[PDB]
Design a protein around this ligand. Structure first.
Ligand SMILES: [Zn+2]
Ligand SMILES: [Zn+2]
Ligand SMILES: [Zn+2]
Ligand SMILES: [Zn+2]
Ligand SMILES: [Zn+2]
Ligand SMILES: [Zn+2]
Lengths: 111, 111
């Protein structure tokens, strides 16, 4: 398919350390499991956490996970840590460029 | 290949309006022409400018161009404009995830 739109919700949220947080990402058309999740902090490139929708990238903490296939996807942090403050993006790569990005979800955590 | 490292230079730069600006990207292994260039504005998702190394995305200003194939790539702004302030990333997609990002080039204008 072409002209695929990616959406994310919430656009921003605040939580507390130890909380379980789940954010969502939707593709306007089916993209199977070709969905990546990034974590981006200030002054750094997006960091790969999840690929193929649910595959945890090597080295990434196990408190991160993803699920979904088709159009609806989720990303979960099982127990928040202060360093998890970041913007989280989803990206589809079902076929060819563009590998459309979601608008991102900005997570804050109380200190 | 696997475990491909992407590098970028400069990591940041300041230039003047009208300047011709060239930034570079390297792949630790042969990625052919599977190389994308993004422009990321503060708080926003990365915007596609160039794909397949040298193909200018529809709507993207002509002052942007990309070249290179294999392991070295260049992104050029023929005439720097005030609206070009952003961080620029390259991304490889030669085969499977990770679609490795370069660490980015932060561009600012000296006015
Ligand atoms: Zn398609
Ligand atoms: Zn791997
Ligand atoms: Zn390979
Ligand atoms: Zn090859
Ligand atoms: Zn080659
Ligand atoms: Zn080289």
């Amino acid at each position: 398919s072409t002209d695929i739109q990616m959406t994310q919700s919430p656009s921003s949220l605040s939580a507390s350390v130890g909380d379980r947080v789940t954010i969502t990402c939707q593709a306007s058309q089916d993209i199977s499991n070709f969905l990546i999740w990034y974590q981006q902090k200030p002054g750094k490139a997006p960091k790969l956490l999840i690929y193929d929708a649910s595959n945890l990238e090597t080295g990434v903490p196990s408190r991160f996970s993803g699920s979904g296939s088709g159009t609806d996807f989720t990303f979960t942090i099982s127990s928040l840590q202060p360093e998890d403050i970041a913007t989280y993006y989803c990206q589809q790569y079902h076929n060819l460029p563009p590998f459309t990005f979601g608008p991102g979800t900005k997570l804050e955590i109380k200190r």
